[PDB]
């Protein structure tokens, strides 16, 4: 390093979080006016697939970092009349612009601003986790701060979005939902009054941005609430056993720490209710709640479907003794939780809906919060062939794109070959008439031995047959986090 002097950018680390087809940095802001398509893209698909990826503008100041900490890079694939175009742009966060001003990374440990350079922006957010259309803009979200608005067509950054000053929490979820009956934005905040606070808030916003209802209450301790579930009548907050200690953070340590002897906790509250209506339920220890597939309620009972994993998958938030289990050890599958508000019992056990591990679930947007029978999922089957030119098996490697029928319990999956894996899918209805889950499943396919990327389109009526269309991208797309479909 010394012979590089002080005027070069420092090298990226040679760690797994910066290596291979999935995690090597890209940093490409791009416009591709027309994409090559193999196969036949249905001409009736009309709208934009937005996705956000962490994609660090600079090598991290500390010489190491986690995937979840990268500057948000939003892609929009716009589908019209059989043609697809791509725009990819950074969210111009205060954090990004400060780093660009200095020409280097100014930010330290994930969600620990005490370890930043004093020239870092005050707002620590990277707006890197999800995207959703709301009130005429695209919101780029990350759960440590308010979201950042972008122009739906150009992906120009509009600024921090405060919802016309109505949202008074310190943070806003990256897992809001759109209510399919009203178009309301259903959202929440944890650590809602600052670092380490136990405050939780539910928010409900009209499609035109008006705050319709809020419910402030407190958890028994500060914990990660990554995703949530909203039904017709209830909201459920899953508190993952990852706890916050501000003193540990002042000393340079991680924002969260896994607690292996702390029950999974759920707060269940009426959607139009108040703090005093909150009820708490407890699940097993040493397990953690994945992303919500869907949820609904009927009579006394709230049902929530999600992956549940039997131990700490977050190696960067280790328990106090430093131990982290080998990810391969951990039992995971899709589960249904049932919260019976009329029962005597606080204690819940999740019931399996699959016998295989999976993540990145997607239901039909039109059935969010309602009784439903279908989900799309990514899964990893370790017995499928794996081309050794892929390199070592990366974090968030999923070699199957799956349609699960909840009525029969059967799965219909596409395997893309031994050099392929997937990013989070979206579902596009075949028409506004179409029955539940009848349409197209669209996802990025990473061809990791070639370091190439395609956006694939499958027909939900026959997933095993593979793509009806493969949209070739002329550069490698880094692994992403969440995306959404915005219908024209
Ligand atoms: Fe998420």
Numbering used by the authors: -6 to 481
From the manuscript:
Lignostilbene-α,β-dioxygenases (LSDs), also known as stilbene cleaving oxygenases (SCOs), catalyze the cleavage of the double bonds of intermediate stilbenes (e.g. resveratrol), yielding small modified benzaldehydes. SCO enzymes are one branch of a much larger family that also includes carotenoid cleavage oxygenases or dioxygenases (CCOs or CCDs) as well as 9-cis-epoxycarotenoid dioxygenases (NCEDs). Despite varied amino acid sequences, the enzymes share a common seven-bladed β-propeller fold that orients the four fully conserved, Fe-coordinating His residues in the catalytic center, adjacent to which a hydrophobic substrate-binding site is formed by a helix-loop-containing domain.
The structure of the enzyme determined by X-ray crystallography, and refined to 1.9 Å, contains the conserved seven-bladed β-propeller and 4-His-Fe(II) motifs characteristic of carotenoid and stilbene cleavage oxygenases. The secondary structure of PbLSD is composed primarily of β strands, 27 in total, organized in a seven-bladed β-propeller motif with blades comprised of 3, 4 or 5 β strands. Despite the addition of EDTA to the protein purification protocol, density representing what is most likely a single iron atom at the reaction center of each monomer, is observed and secured by four histidine residues at a distance of 2.1 Å and has a fifth ligand association to a water or hydroxide also at 2.1 Å. The sixth metal-ligand coordinating position, is occluded by a nearby (4.4 Å) threonine (T122) methyl group. In three of the four subunits, the density clearly resembled and was satisfied by water, but in the fourth, the density resembled dioxygen in shape but was satisfied by a single oxygen atom, suggesting partial occupancy. All monomers presented a continuous main chain to the C-terminal Gly481 and could be superimposed with an average root mean squared deviation of the main chain atoms in the six combinations of 0.26 Å. The relevance of the remaining cavities and/or tunnels generally lies with substrate access and product release, and thus specificity and selectivity of the enzymes. In the case of PbLSD, the cavity on the left in Fig. 6a (highlighted by an arrow), and extending from the surface diagonally down to the catalytic site, is similar to that observed in the SCO NOV1 structure. However, it is possible to extend the existing substrate cavity into a continuous tunnel spanning the width of the enzyme by a simple rotation of the side chains of just two amino acids, Lys135 and Asp137. Resveratrol was docked in the cavity with its single cleavable double bond directly above the Fe center, at a distance of 4.6 Å, consistent with the enzyme’s in vitro activity against the substrate.
